[PDB]
Design a protein around this ligand. Structure first.
Ligand SMILES: Nc1ncnc2c1ncn2[C@@H]1O[C@H](COP(=O)(O)OP(=O)(O)O)[C@@H](O)[C@H]1O
Ligand SMILES: [Br-]
Ligand SMILES: [Br-]
Ligand SMILES: [Br-]
Ligand SMILES: [Br-]
Ligand SMILES: [Mn+2]
Ligand SMILES: [Mn+2]
Ligand SMILES: [Mn+2]
Ligand SMILES: [Mn+2]
Ligand SMILES: [Mn+2]
Ligand SMILES: [Mn+2]
Ligand SMILES: [Mn+2]
Ligand SMILES: [Mn+2]
Ligand code: NA
Ligand code: NA
Length: 168
């Protein structure tokens, strides 16, 4: 089933600003519902060990999301991963980046353990999330944006708004 609305994915390393940006979109743009996928994964135990996610866990998540994604209205999906989702769902994929100094501080203030913080810092340096998104979706719908400041966030949301209007 083809989506009835406009669907956006916001992805990027933990701490890059996905949830913040998705909530800005849901607040500022017309008719967007935010799906915080990490919360779905927790709430529904869509994982094997919230850590290890196996093939079957992905399948169950997708079955849960499918009816939402094809429903009327617009959706802004927020998740650190992207390869798992069908290209059918999305009209835009936004990948957020953050400078290492800014990211480190966010991860500290948000209280990640030192190991998880370092793991996430390395993932950002290695461009894991961006490479995944570019491998999984058509290059023309992928927007990559530096997201260090609130001014940057707002400008990105303006670019999204412009792109959405075109799609609409
Ligand atoms: N563009 C931005 N400019 C400044 N601070 C930001 C920005 N985006 C996010 N933040 C800060 O980083 C914190 C964590 O961001 P969050 O949206 O939770 O990231 P993610 O969902 O990618 O893990 C926010 O609570 C806020 O303090
Ligand atoms: Br809009
Ligand atoms: Br949600
Ligand atoms: Br997430
Ligand atoms: Br700022
Ligand atoms: Mn988040
Ligand atoms: Mn929300
Ligand atoms: Mn997860
Ligand atoms: Mn599968
Ligand atoms: Mn809907
Ligand atoms: Mn510790
Ligand atoms: Mn983490
Ligand atoms: Mn693909
Ligand atoms: Na791959
Ligand atoms: Na590749």
């Amino acid at each position: 089933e083809q989506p009835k609305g406009i669907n956006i994915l916001i992805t990027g390393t933990p701490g890059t600003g996905k949830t913040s940006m998705a909530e800005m979109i849901a607040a500022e743009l017309d008719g967007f519902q935010h799906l915080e996928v990490g919360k779905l994964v927790k709430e529904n135990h869509f994982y094997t060990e919230t850590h290890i996610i196996e093939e079957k866990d992905e399948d169950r998540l997708l079955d849960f999301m499918e009816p939402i994604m094809v429903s009327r209205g617009n959706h802004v999906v927020d998740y650190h991963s992207s390869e798992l989702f069908p290209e059918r769902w999305f009209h835009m994929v936004v990948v957020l980046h953050t400078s290492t100094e800014v990211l480190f501080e966010r991860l500290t203030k948000r209280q990640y353990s030192e190991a998880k913080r370092a793991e996430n810092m390395e993932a950002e340096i290695q461009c894991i999330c961006e490479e995944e998104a570019r491998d999984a979706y058509e290059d023309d719908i992928v927007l990559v944006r530096e997201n260090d400041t609130l001014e940057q966030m707002a400008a990105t949301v303006e670019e999204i708004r412009e792109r959405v209007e075109v799609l609409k």
